[PDB]
Ligand binder design. Sequence first.
Ligand SMILES: Nc1nc(=O)c(N)c(NC[C@H](O)[C@H](O)[C@H](O)COP(=O)(O)O)[nH]1
Ligand SMILES: [Zn+2]
Length: 183
Amino acid sequence: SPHAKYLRECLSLAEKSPPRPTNFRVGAILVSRKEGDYKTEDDRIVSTGYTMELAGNTHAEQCCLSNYAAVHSVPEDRVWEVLPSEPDRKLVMYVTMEPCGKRLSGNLPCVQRIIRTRQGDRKGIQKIYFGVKEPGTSEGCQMLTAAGIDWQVVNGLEREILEVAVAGHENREEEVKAALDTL
Ligand SMILES: Nc1nc(=O)c(N)c(NC[C@H](O)[C@H](O)[C@H](O)COP(=O)(O)O)[nH]1
Ligand SMILES: [Zn+2]
C-alpha cells in the first residue's frame, strides 16, 4: 500500500512533536497526485507538518498548511490562494489521526482549515487519508463528508500511531487500549 507507506512517514513526523498533556502527537503530509491511474513516482510532496512544529498551539495539519503559506508570503488562513490547483492533479493529505472537528482550546479545527482550501477557482484538498479515528468518548470524518471532502481510513498501523500520539499522557496505556477496542 502506498497509503500505508505515506502514513508511516507521517508517523516519523509525529515523533518530532514535543509531548504535552492536552493534545496528540500527529504528522501530516500534503501530496499533489495525478488524476486517474497515478504512479506513486509521480506524486509530488507539497508540504509536511507535525504537532507544535510551529510556535503556538498548532496541529499537524495546521502546520502543514502554515509551512506552505509561509514560503508563499501569506498567513495560513489565506493558503487557499497559493496552493497549486492544476487541471490534471489533486491535492490529498495524509494524517496519522482523523482531523479534528473541534478543539477544546477554541482554535479553528483542522477540518475547517481543510475545507477552506476549496475557495474561488481553487480545487483545494480533495481527500484525507488517515490511520486512526480521533480517540475519545460531530466526528471530523462526518464534517469532511458534509463539505464534500473525501476520506479513507488506512488500516494496519493503529497501535503504533496511537502509542506515538498519546506519549505525553498519564493515562497513555489505558488510552491506547480503549482506542484499539473501538476497532
Ligand atoms: N489530528 C490531530 N492533529 C494534531 O496535531 C492534534 N493536536 C490533534 N488533537 C485533537 C484534540 O482534540 C485537541 O488536541 C484537543 O481538543 C485540545 O485542543 P488543542 O489542541 O489544545 O487546540 N489532532
Ligand atoms: Zn486539528
